[PDB]
Design a protein around this ligand. Sequence first.
Ligand SMILES: COc1ccc([C@@H]2C(C#N)=C(N)OC3=C2C(=O)C[C@@H](c2cccc4ccccc24)C3)cc1
Ligand SMILES: COc1ccc([C@@H]2C(C#N)=C(N)OC3=C2C(=O)C[C@@H](c2cccc4ccccc24)C3)cc1
Ligand SMILES: COc1ccc([C@@H]2C(C#N)=C(N)OC3=C2C(=O)C[C@@H](c2cccc4ccccc24)C3)cc1
Ligand SMILES: [Ba+2]
Ligand SMILES: [Ba+2]
Ligand SMILES: [Ba+2]
Ligand SMILES: [Ba+2]
Ligand SMILES: [Ba+2]
Ligand SMILES: [Ba+2]
Ligand SMILES: [Rb+]
Ligand SMILES: [Rb+]
Ligand SMILES: [Rb+]
Lengths: 386, 386, 386
Amino acid sequence: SFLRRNALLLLTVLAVILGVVLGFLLRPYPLSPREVKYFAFPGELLMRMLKMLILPLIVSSLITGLASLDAKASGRLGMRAVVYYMSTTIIAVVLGIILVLIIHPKEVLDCFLDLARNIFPSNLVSAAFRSYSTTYGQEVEGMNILGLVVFSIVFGIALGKMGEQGQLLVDFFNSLNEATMKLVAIIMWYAPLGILFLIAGKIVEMYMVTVIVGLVIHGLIVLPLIYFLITRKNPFVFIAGILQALITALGTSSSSATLPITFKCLEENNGVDKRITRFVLPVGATINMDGTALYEAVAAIFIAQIITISITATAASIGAAGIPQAGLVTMVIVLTAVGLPTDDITLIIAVDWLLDRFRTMVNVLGDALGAGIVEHLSRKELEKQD
Amino acid sequence: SFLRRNALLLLTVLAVILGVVLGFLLRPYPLSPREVKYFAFPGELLMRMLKMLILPLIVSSLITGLASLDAKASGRLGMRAVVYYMSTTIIAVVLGIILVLIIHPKEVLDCFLDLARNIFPSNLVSAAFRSYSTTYGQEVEGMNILGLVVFSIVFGIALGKMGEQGQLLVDFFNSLNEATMKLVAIIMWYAPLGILFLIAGKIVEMYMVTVIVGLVIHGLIVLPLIYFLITRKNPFVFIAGILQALITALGTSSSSATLPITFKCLEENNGVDKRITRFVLPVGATINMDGTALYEAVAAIFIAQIITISITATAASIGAAGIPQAGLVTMVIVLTAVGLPTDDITLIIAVDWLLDRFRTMVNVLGDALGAGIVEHLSRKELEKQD
Amino acid sequence: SFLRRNALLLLTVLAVILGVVLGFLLRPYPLSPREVKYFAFPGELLMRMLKMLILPLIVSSLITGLASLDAKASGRLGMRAVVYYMSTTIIAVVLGIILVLIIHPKEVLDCFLDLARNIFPSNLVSAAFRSYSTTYGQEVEGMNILGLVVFSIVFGIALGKMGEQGQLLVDFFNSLNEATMKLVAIIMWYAPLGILFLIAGKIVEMYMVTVIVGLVIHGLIVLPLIYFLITRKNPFVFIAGILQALITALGTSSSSATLPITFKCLEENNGVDKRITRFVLPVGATINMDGTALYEAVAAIFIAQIITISITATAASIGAAGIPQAGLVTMVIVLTAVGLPTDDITLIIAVDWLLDRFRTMVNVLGDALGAGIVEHLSRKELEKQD
Ligand SMILES: COc1ccc([C@@H]2C(C#N)=C(N)OC3=C2C(=O)C[C@@H](c2cccc4ccccc24)C3)cc1
Ligand SMILES: COc1ccc([C@@H]2C(C#N)=C(N)OC3=C2C(=O)C[C@@H](c2cccc4ccccc24)C3)cc1
Ligand SMILES: COc1ccc([C@@H]2C(C#N)=C(N)OC3=C2C(=O)C[C@@H](c2cccc4ccccc24)C3)cc1
Ligand SMILES: [Ba+2]
Ligand SMILES: [Ba+2]
Ligand SMILES: [Ba+2]
Ligand SMILES: [Ba+2]
Ligand SMILES: [Ba+2]
Ligand SMILES: [Ba+2]
Ligand SMILES: [Rb+]
Ligand SMILES: [Rb+]
Ligand SMILES: [Rb+]
């Protein structure tokens, strides 16, 4: 009965172990890294299929998400969601400093300007695939999620204040979100074939231990106890539904790439209201620092062998939303403010390929558990609409 | 009562004087021009917020603008609008020659080919952010307004001939125009904070006098007397409404960047019919040469110290719609036809930063006063639809 | 009466002869090839006008084409269409080997990977104008038709399974297809002026004979006899309607560029059902190899003076959908698998300018005659919907 009910998640569990085993079976690499790319190809296709659906999901989710909700109420439960994104990050930043205290193993100012320049895009067509970042054309390949999310929020809320006239395109983007979420059903089945070929190509190439210690204790103790404190419901039962999304989080290593799956794992598996998931999930894929700030704060102290380092590490990953090799460049810029050499970066690249997979896993769990706290803390607002 | 009724325009007047004063207070610049960019940043954000809204306003304005109007009648009042864009330019070109007579202070052929190549875009997605211009990829960053306006006009009129089937997406773009015009309400409030920081960063760096003499006499005598001749109504009362747009025209220095504000200053402040503003304003932001041809014709004679120079100067700025540093490159190409050195251009760049602000001010007033003449000369066509 | 009924096709026939005559009248070229570009300009404008309409036609045709049809039935008549695209190619590849037997006159593996990478686009906005192809950014200018067609098919069929919710945007893209097909009426009239100036600029610059022999025998014997075998109707009567599209196929030399005209020549001239033309024509503009594989297979044997060469030549042109100079680069990659020098390519470029015009003519006829066979072999499926 277990193999019949939960069939696809047992396949992804089989894909993780088979991906490690087959990868370790073909570990002595006599072939050039060019041939490794040809081997990791079936997993590379899944990423293209997922990246395809990021843009028409993020745009359509928020536009309907802020329109379905009253402009006055949505602005209030939105501030309630900010409470989660700020508190969990504060505890994580604090946890990172204690973690290195017991077990010790482009300009800086320009990144705060590029983040503000990315928030308000110059062209929405250019925002859909090019992100702004000052270089010495500043626009470079990689979706400007921070700009599209900002426009979608103010555009979506403008439709809530429109009513009669606005009703047309709101029904359009809801049908569009339903269309893009009907394409995700097929992408979920290609995931086992993808993941096993994707992680196998990435394996064939004490700080590492420090990171996982803090990441697991935050995702299994800190975050679930925050959920149990307000909702008064078991967190593992909520975790059981989002299992098909948390396993893919390791393979994808991007919260944006897993967003189409994470959406179905909350709306279908756990049974969470669409009106709040469409409001929490897109913002959470960029604003949430729970896992990525906890990874970057530990990275700064390890190579050095306090308030200024934390703020710079936060504004780094928010500025580099879904751009390829985001963690690689952001760690360089954060070292200019502290005054540390860039020679140590040549070693963390050969260890980030497995550590970034767990970084996303905490980030995806945070947005999912965040929506669970939001739903319970906004039940009266949701009943007002019905 | 005056401070209560007209509050935001008194703030922009305060922003202009405070922008000059604070700029002159911090005039001795010990900092590198890189730091000037960081200072002019709050005004740089307003430009990104305005450029954001250009594209979804221009596309949606014309599509509904030509569909709401009868395909037979719209084609006729359109020719009536061409009468304005041709006559005012002829008088301006003539005024420029008299102005230099009393007070004397890529190829040419390729620009006429690039203009024709820009009119019909090869790809509408590429047209939304890349303009065609031959270089020795010809497509370069900067919206192809000339191509999007052309498509929107023939696409919008195709919906007027569609009727029943076409009614769906016409109601979509009208709701979309209403959405983009509901976002402009917040951008209008960021303008005082923007303008004061934007003009201050631009101040810290007899021909100049000749230009303003011709520009003021055209905008305060020539254009208002043309309005008073047909409408038989006071032009200053019409100018009083568009005050919030004319002040921003100095700061933005682009007729396209001020189009979202100019739209509200005509539809809300002066109380002009949407059906004709959506028809006159987008075309006027590119086709109108009243101020920019009057600036370029005087530029040619001053550095030289007749029919061929005027036509080449007209087709230059129409070809370079909203592309950055349009006046800088177009003045180089116009000198090849007359046979004059490019050494004189190194001096006008340090004076254009204040002169281009008044160039746009005449251009924005021309499109606004043009719509006023169009409304009065097409009252019977508008009554036919009701 | 003949000049009155069929007026525009007699003009395009006049354009072909006048284009050759005027071109041969101005054959001794004393002007640099830069001036030839300025001469071929009125035909260059038609191509921009046609390329403009490719993207909003391909996207809107398939989305409504798979939604109007039942998800179960469409998947079946789709397999019936694959029968045509596979059988006609098999006969063509076989015909090419017999044609060279009687009358004898980036990596290879990467192209099979790039084709799979193009099928699933990473970003739909980027897919609308940039195609993926590995180079040693892989994304380069030229519409990713293979990616947009794939998305449109799975997105369109997702709307058929949506019903009530999906009904909104399906009526949108059908009105949009009707809009883009109402713009094509004016482009059809610019074609005679275009073609005569476009072919004249291309003329002023035994293998050639071998190609036309096989191309004419396939398009006038093989393909029409396949039509007459199933439909039991005269093929020349069906060819008579699509005459306005077949003449333009010579001028455009691209099946995608002629798609907007080919659509009207089937829906209006021959009177074919929209539901199947919108399903056959976009796929046929890329997947069909009837003419282009017959051109490339003969190209390999001529320069050499069997199963491995045919498969590589097929996957080459499908990978290079509508990208400029597709036949030039694909012939280089196919020679690496066989092991032949690239010195022979410097001669075929000066002969492809007339041979590629007939290559498309066979490809356009194949898609048109394919739709004719599909309609007759799916009459019962079409009656089920009514
Ligand atoms: C800096 O990064 C952000 C931007 C937004 C948010 C919140 C959020 C989430 N999650 C969503 N979906 O909507 C709103 C939020 C508000 O705080 C306020 C709320 C809102 C209401 C009314 C007018 C607004 C005008 C501008 C911005 C937000 C507005 C909408 C959080 C972080
Ligand atoms: C060269 O730059 C331009 C293009 C257009 C215009 C006029 C205009 C303004 N303002 C608008 N909104 O629509 C039309 C205009 C016509 O003259 C004619 C009118 C029109 C009616 C019917 C069919 C047409 C077909 C092609 C072009 C315009 C057409 C529309 C002016 C300058
Ligand atoms: C490789 O290049 C292609 C892709 C598609 C096609 C066929 C086609 C044509 N012509 C169209 N318009 O739709 C479908 C086709 C199917 O074979 C199958 C059919 C279909 C039905 C149901 C689910 C599908 C899921 C994925 C792909 C096709 C699907 C749609 C042919 C070649
Ligand atoms: Ba957080
Ligand atoms: Ba509402
Ligand atoms: Ba004018
Ligand atoms: Ba109408
Ligand atoms: Ba075929
Ligand atoms: Ba249906
Ligand atoms: Rb990541
Ligand atoms: Rb300007
Ligand atoms: Rb071709």
